Amino acid sequence: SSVQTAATSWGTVPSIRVYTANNGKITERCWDGKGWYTGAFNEPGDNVSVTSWLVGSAIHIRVYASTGTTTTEWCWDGNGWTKGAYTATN
Numbered sequence: 064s065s066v067q068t069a070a071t072s073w074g075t076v077p078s079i080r081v082y083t084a085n086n087g088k089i090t091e092r093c094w095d096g097k098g099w100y101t102g103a104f105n106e107p108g109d110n111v112s113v114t115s116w117l118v119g120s121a122i123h124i125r126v127y128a129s130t131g132t133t134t135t136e137w138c139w140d141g142n143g144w145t146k147g148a149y150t151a152t153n
């Protein structure tokens with residue numbers, strides 16, 4: 064089987080974030096113009112999607128991590144990954 068990725072970007076540098084679901088776990092790689100480095104995101108999941116938006120120059124990232132029929136939303140708003148309110152009845 065294959066790892067599964069999701070990607071987002073912002074600005075004109077740009078910043079890029081790539082999330083990889085590998086063998087039950089999601090991790091994050093980061094580009095800020097000067098080489099790829101490892102991000103702070105680490106959460107369980109077999110499937111991942113992502114979206115992001117800016118308020119001014121402040122990025123807001125939402126990562127949707129799924130295992131079985133449960134999807135958990137993880138939020139980056141400048142100061143730590145927090146659990147979002149997203150729910151669904153799958």
Ligand SMILES: Cc1c(C)c2c3c4c1OP(=O)(O)Oc1c(C)c(C)c5c(c1C4)Cc1c(c(c(C)c(C)c1OP(=O)(O)O5)OP(=O)(O)O2)C3
Nearest residue numbers: 064065066067068083084085086087088108109110111131
């Ligand atoms: C994310 C994901 C996991 C965690 C899976 C599987 C798949 C999977 O989806 P994805 O990778 O998108 O799609 C596949 C792709 C692209 C290929 C080429 C596959 C398989 C899948 C399906 C089938 C498959 C699966 C296996 C194992 C051990 C093998 C050998 C295995 O045959 P393989 O010769 O790789 O063929 O179980 P595994 O615990 O990895 O479960 C089942």
Ligand SMILES: Cc1c(C)c2c3c4c1OP(=O)(O)Oc1c(C)c(C)c5c(c1C4)Cc1c(c(c(C)c(C)c1OP(=O)(O)O5)OP(=O)(O)O2)C3
Nearest residue numbers: 064065066067084085086087088108109110129130131132
């Ligand atoms: C428990 C279980 C069930 C009930 C599955 C599948 C898997 C599965 O997990 P597991 O067997 O541990 O991991 C896999 C391994 C080790 C290999 C080598 C696999 C697959 C899986 C994934 C992918 C796969 C699946 C298929 C079918 C018909 C094929 C041909 C098929 O490609 P196959 O050449 O076997 O590759 O559907 P199936 O109804 O069997 O659903 C999907």
Ligand SMILES: OC[C@@]1(O)OC[C@@H](O)[C@@H](O)[C@@H]1O
Nearest residue numbers: 080091093101102103104139
């Ligand atoms: O500069 C890297 C970082 O802080 O960027 C914002 C988010 O992508 C974080 O997970 C990541 O560690």
Ligand SMILES: OC[C@@]1(O)OC[C@@H](O)[C@@H](O)[C@@H]1O
Nearest residue numbers: 125136138140146147148149
């Ligand atoms: O500030 C976090 C939050 O309110 O952001 C907007 C949505 O992503 C919500 O699910 C999430 O709880």
Ligand SMILES: [Cl-]
Nearest residue numbers: 097098099100
């Ligand atoms: Cl690099």
Ligand SMILES: [Cl-]
Nearest residue numbers: 103142143144
């Ligand atoms: Cl964090």
